[PDB]
């Protein structure tokens, strides 16, 4: 079966190259950590309006000032 | 007395059949193909991600106004 890759690649060299692109395409999205950066950006794109809520006692976090360090940090991308 | 056949001066031209001007064969090809292909993918992620940065910038002006 070791020459089976060398008696068809010298016989029909078209679909042999297709199966190699069938390979190396399913496997790699589960491999490199550049994915889940695809997920963090695609969720952090603001379409709609972020409506604020009503305070009653608490206040667990996030006061009215927008430029305060009160929310998350997606600002790694601008530094990236 | 004025007939043809000359004393000398002959070639001939060849009956040969050859022009093997190769040509960067034998695994030297497929090497300039793959590296330049990933070079085009390397040109990505510095433009699409850059335009993605401007894309949030574009949507930023929409959300800041409209109260």
From Swiss-Prot, chain A:
Complex I is composed of 45 different subunits. It is a single-pass membrane protein. This is NADH dehydrogenase [ubiquinone] 1 alpha subcomplex subunit 3. The chain crosses the membrane at residues 14-34. Residues 52-80 are annotated as: Disordered. The keyword NADP does not apply. GO terms for cellular component: mitochondrial inner membrane; mitochondrion; respiratory chain complex I. It comes from Bos taurus (Bovine). InterPro entries: NDUFA3 (IPR026626). Belongs to the complex I NDUFA3 subunit family. It is found in: Mitochondrion inner membrane. Keywords: Acetylation, Electron transport, Membrane, Mitochondrion, Mitochondrion inner membrane, Respiratory chain, Transmembrane, Transmembrane helix, Transport. Accessory subunit of the mitochondrial membrane respiratory chain NADH dehydrogenase (Complex I), that is believed not to be involved in catalysis. Complex I functions in the transfer of electrons from NADH to the respiratory chain. The immediate electron acceptor for the enzyme is believed to be ubiquinone.
From Swiss-Prot, chain B:
It is found in: Mitochondrion inner membrane; Nucleus. The chain crosses the membrane at residues 24-45. Belongs to the complex I NDUFA13 subunit family. Complex I is composed of 45 different subunits. Interacts with CARD15, but not with CARD4. Interacts with STAT3, but not with STAT1, STAT2 and STAT5A. Interacts with OLFM4. Accessory subunit of the mitochondrial membrane respiratory chain NADH dehydrogenase (Complex I), that is believed not to be involved in catalysis. Complex I functions in the transfer of electrons from NADH to the respiratory chain. The immediate electron acceptor for the enzyme is believed to be ubiquinone. Involved in the interferon/all-trans-retinoic acid (IFN/RA) induced cell death. This apoptotic activity is inhibited by interaction with viral IRF1. Prevents the transactivation of STAT3 target genes. This is NADH dehydrogenase [ubiquinone] 1 alpha subcomplex subunit 13. It comes from Bos taurus. The gene is NDUFA13. The chain holds residues 7 to 73 of 144 of the full protein.
């Amino acid at each position: 079966v070791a020459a089976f890759l060398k008696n068809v690649w010298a016989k029909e060299p078209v679909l042999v190259a297709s199966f190699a692109i069938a390979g190396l395409a399913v496997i790699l999205p589960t491999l490199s950590p550049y994915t889940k950066y695809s997920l963090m950006i695609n969720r952090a794109t603001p379409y709609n309006y972020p409506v604020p809520l009503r305070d009653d006692g608490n206040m667990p976090d996030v006061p009215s000032h927008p430029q305060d360090p009160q929310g998350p940090s997606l600002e790694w991308l601008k530094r990236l | 007395k004025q007939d043809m056949p000359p004393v000398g001066g002959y070639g001939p031209i060849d009956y040969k059949r050859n022009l093997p001007r190769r040509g960067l064969s034998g695994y030297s090809m497929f090497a300039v193909g793959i590296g330049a292909l990933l070079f085009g993918y390397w040109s990505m992620m510095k433009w699409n991600r850059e335009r993605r940065r401007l894309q949030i910038e574009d949507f930023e002006a929409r959300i800041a106004l409209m109260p």
